[PDB]
Design a protein around this ligand. Structure first.
Ligand SMILES: CN(CC#Cc1nc2c(N)ncnc2n1[C@@H]1O[C@H](CNC(=O)Nc2cccc3ccccc23)[C@@H](O)[C@H]1O)C[C@H]1O[C@@H](n2cnc3c(N)ncnc32)[C@H](O)[C@@H]1O
Ligand SMILES: CN(CC#Cc1nc2c(N)ncnc2n1[C@@H]1O[C@H](CNC(=O)Nc2cccc3ccccc23)[C@@H](O)[C@H]1O)C[C@H]1O[C@@H](n2cnc3c(N)ncnc32)[C@H](O)[C@@H]1O
Ligand SMILES: CN(CC#Cc1nc2c(N)ncnc2n1[C@@H]1O[C@H](CNC(=O)Nc2cccc3ccccc23)[C@@H](O)[C@H]1O)C[C@H]1O[C@@H](n2cnc3c(N)ncnc32)[C@H](O)[C@@H]1O
Ligand SMILES: CN(CC#Cc1nc2c(N)ncnc2n1[C@@H]1O[C@H](CNC(=O)Nc2cccc3ccccc23)[C@@H](O)[C@H]1O)C[C@H]1O[C@@H](n2cnc3c(N)ncnc32)[C@H](O)[C@@H]1O
Lengths: 259, 259, 259, 259
């Protein structure tokens, strides 16, 4: 079936990509980077993120696979030495698909929407970051600090984790909001705790004075001007992985952070 | 319909309970503290917890209602001044039921199971608390510290919150584990972050050396001797509330912690 | 004696500054914004910071005084209603001076040094912030995250506090380093805890790859290019306050954050 | 000169203690566990703590030395393989003494005072721990939670660290207070941040309702009944170490927690 392969760009990843392609030639696997059904990432989680965003408009017709050439990633959970064994089962099929929820970010001024696999982040364009946080049209708090991070389930082991957020299993269709260095005194008051919102809940950020913010989605971070609203909600779209062996999320957590 | 009313025990709560009963007498509402269908708590969240545990074996046939005589609680979300208006709608009906997930705690040595509305906590009986944490039969970490807290969704605004845990909407069928003062060095390593587990996941705690632990479920805290295993999982049972007005969880959070 | 007065710039602060000046005219108090011995700030802590930096090269010959027109600040610990009583004791004298330690920041490429009253902060110019942290010529850790904050004693109630740092009494000649969102896994390892360094200890930050950093000292934040080293140490210079009533630091903390 | 040696009690530590004694016999080093001038601990930090408390009434006439048979400790900073080289320099002398500050804890009901090398901890005897915290006779906050930890400088790498406290160099004559799981809402308010107090500052804990508390000093934890006041202050006494090689505190931190 149709497939494509992204590479980190170094000698190790490029040479492994050419060997897999030659392995796929020994089957009737057509290379097609326009309409692939199978997307293989080789490198690290950053390389996987690029591959996800490169085909984020055909997520429903693609199964992703990660191969880590550096250290183990959460999305690149295949060592290079298992590449030949990976090629065989890919060519036949008989693999189940697992789906992780995604995060939708709407930015009104027209309006622009983004899909994130890890998280969507807002900071100030210089000076204080002040937003009113609104949950399902309910004013929840006025946040003054460095920024905010809305994380997918599978993103919680990333930036969200460094911000004190909880780690949550990717089968939970939810999103998690964490704070960056909120000021808290008699005047300003934030909840402090991370917040975990379910599907169909809309978290909206509304500016107070400064309307310019630096918003980032996974890799890309672009400065938005004259922002009226930032909306977060669990996406209706989901990223599909091709799984062959059992690699539970919590084992992946153990290997990455404990031993 | 059958109903009963629990009181905090002070003058304010006892006198409000007698006035509601007299109000219920003006309807055909039979008082029955053996098989009630409606359980009204008057006082604070602690008073509500007692009422929940008093009838924790008939949760499927009961709708709970909380009235806070002190400050606002998360389960006692009715002011005393709304008691008369509460009596009327209760007697008629035409109220929807909302259900919050619960936490099941199994303690093997026979074996004893408990149901918690807030959280289940383990500490050492004196000296160091050391347990191996196992997730779905996968050894995750060896924890050395003061203890661990497994919190329901609606419990996350309680002890879980003071332990740095995330706050999560009660519609999410999950449980959250937080640490108390874990040591972390070159020898000992814990994840640190709070963990959010979905339904049908079993978190098991297994002793290393000391087998005596102080385990607490909501109010009660009993010392267990010669413990072989502590199992946590999302309960199949759910607590049902009787809701009349709209009081969203996040509004309840706002009122309790922000303003 | 010679004196000058800085104003926040709004109607309330400007009108109070003109009334104090007229009050000082009723004494032989010469206004001199070039070589003042007494610097009065009117507004908030930000207004005080500006006044400190405006005369940071004559700190040894100046006593500062703060008047908060908005809410209470840590440096502007005088209400406007006490301005007349402040003018009298200032004109006579008979006031003791209290001194708070300061932070010195050296940036080598020549080299530039800065004096901070609150804290000195480093972040990346875009992308990952990676520095090697060196303590008294001892490689301590390789930091990967959003940035670092070195805080004076009296700065610990500011940014340092929002970053989880400890609050410390200003009589302690020390500086405190806190982290912003450090990544921690099997590869990267930071201490996590805030660090409190004594006088004559030199904390040096050394770049790994990217040499561009956004460094901020109190108000000002300037982008530095081709940075070779950032040195932190307790300054030999100290800021002198003019104190009239007893306002202990811990009372100032209580009023600002508790009640 | 007079000396004694404490052992952890296992085969490795006991056999090393007998070899050092035989090594000391080859000099005119008199063994005297009643009035020793040199106290050698063999085992871990716990073994060192016991040795400190065993002679806590002759601290001014003793230099302590630690040898870690397990992993490296902060006080047992000598490997067993360096025992012979340690014996030689001990017998001659020509070693400088370094002194770490200590913590004094007064418990009034008569009154009992304690000296700690790591920290002094208070918890409730069952149920809620509620104390009013008073700083230099100034009511600072009403604490409701699990407990409080007052840590020496050299204790900050211990329990204090697990409680989010700052790590501070032992040359700083100070003490640090950290919280355990303080509740914080609209009713209850604590500072949250760790607090670092200088010498001659008195932190006093005063009960609200329950007068029974479990107080611990380093190893020992005893239940106190009918407590009227708990006083913390930097002790006037100091523990003296015998140092031979340069082992800076921050290197000791690096080895223990980073690499
Ligand atoms: C513009 N101020 C002036 C100051 C000061 C200040 N001194 C102290 C102090 N010794 N002790 C206790 N409180 C203090 N104040 C309190 O500062 C409040 C106003 N300042 C403020 O809103 N600043 C910011 C808040 C949030 C985001 C910001 C982003 C960019 C720049 C500033 C931000 C007053 O009301 C005073 O009461 C500069 C100070 O801003 C501190 N700062 C920067 N980032 C954060 C942050 N993320 N969280 C908390 N603080 C932050 C930084 O340390 C500067 O020194
Ligand atoms: C029995 N030890 C002796 C000691 C010491 C000690 N000094 C220091 C220090 N200056 N700097 C750096 N590291 C230190 N060590 C490290 O202590 C490790 C062993 N000790 C330990 O396992 N203790 C505990 C861990 C977890 C739960 C405990 C429950 C009850 C009692 C002790 C518990 C050695 O390997 C050394 O390297 C007493 C010390 O235990 C500290 N402690 C108590 N509770 C916790 C906690 N929840 N988290 C972290 N520490 C805690 C407390 O401060 C005592 O001073
Ligand atoms: C360039 N990466 C790609 C990714 C990813 C990623 N996904 C996950 C995940 N699902 N679960 C677990 N681990 C993950 N990884 C781990 O990311 C490591 C490399 N990435 C990294 O070094 N990033 C950064 C670290 C420190 C400062 C940064 C500043 C700007 C931009 C990125 C920064 C790999 O080794 C993977 O194992 C983008 C991700 O960077 C995350 N990020 C941004 N800021 C921080 C921060 N302050 N602290 C921690 N993470 C941060 C953000 O969430 C992006 O998704
Ligand atoms: C006796 N209460 C009944 C309850 C509850 C409760 N439910 C919730 C909830 N779903 N969501 C939000 N808030 C809640 N409340 C708030 O509880 C406050 C009163 N309770 C309280 O003061 N408890 C304690 C505070 C501090 C130390 C304690 C030590 C031993 C026992 C209890 C302690 C009310 O005002 C409600 O508004 C039992 C609950 O105490 C929680 N708890 C235990 N230890 C801590 C701690 N260290 N920090 C924070 N909470 C702690 C634990 O989870 C029990 O479920």
């Amino acid at each position: 079936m149709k497939y494509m392969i992204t590479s980190k760009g170094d000698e190790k990843s490029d040479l492994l990509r050419l060997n897999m392609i030659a392995g796929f030639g020994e089957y009737d696997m057509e290379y097609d980077d326009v309409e692939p059904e199978i997307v293989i990432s080789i490198g690290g989680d950053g390389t996987f993120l690029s591959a996800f965003h490169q085909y984020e408009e055909r997520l429903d017709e693609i199964a992703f696979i990660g191969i880590h050439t550096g250290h183990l990633g959460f999305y690149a959970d295949w060592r290079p030495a298992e590449a030949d064994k990976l090629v065989k089962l890919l060519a036949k099929g008989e693999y189940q698909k697992v789906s992780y929820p995604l995060l939708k970010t709407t930015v009104k001024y027209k309006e622009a929407t983004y899909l994130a696999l890890n998280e969507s982040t807002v900071k100030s364009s210089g000076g204080p970051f002040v937003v009113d946080v609104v949950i399902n049209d309910i004013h929840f708090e006025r946040f003054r600090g460095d920024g905010l991070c809305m994380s997918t389930p599978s993103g919680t082991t990333a930036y969200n984790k460094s911000l004190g957020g909880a780690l949550m299993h990717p089968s939970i269709e939810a999103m998690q909001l964490t704070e960056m260095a909120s000021i808290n005194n008699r005047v300003y008051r934030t909840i402090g705790s991370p917040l975990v919102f379910p599907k169909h809940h809309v978290v909206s950020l509304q500016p107070v004075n400064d309307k310019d913010f630096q918003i980032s989605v996974d890799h890309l971070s672009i400065l938005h001007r004259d922002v009226q609203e930032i909306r977060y909600e669990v996406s209706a779209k989901k990223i599909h992985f091709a799984r062959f062996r059992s690699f539970p999320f919590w084992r992946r957590v153990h290997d990455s952070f404990i031993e």
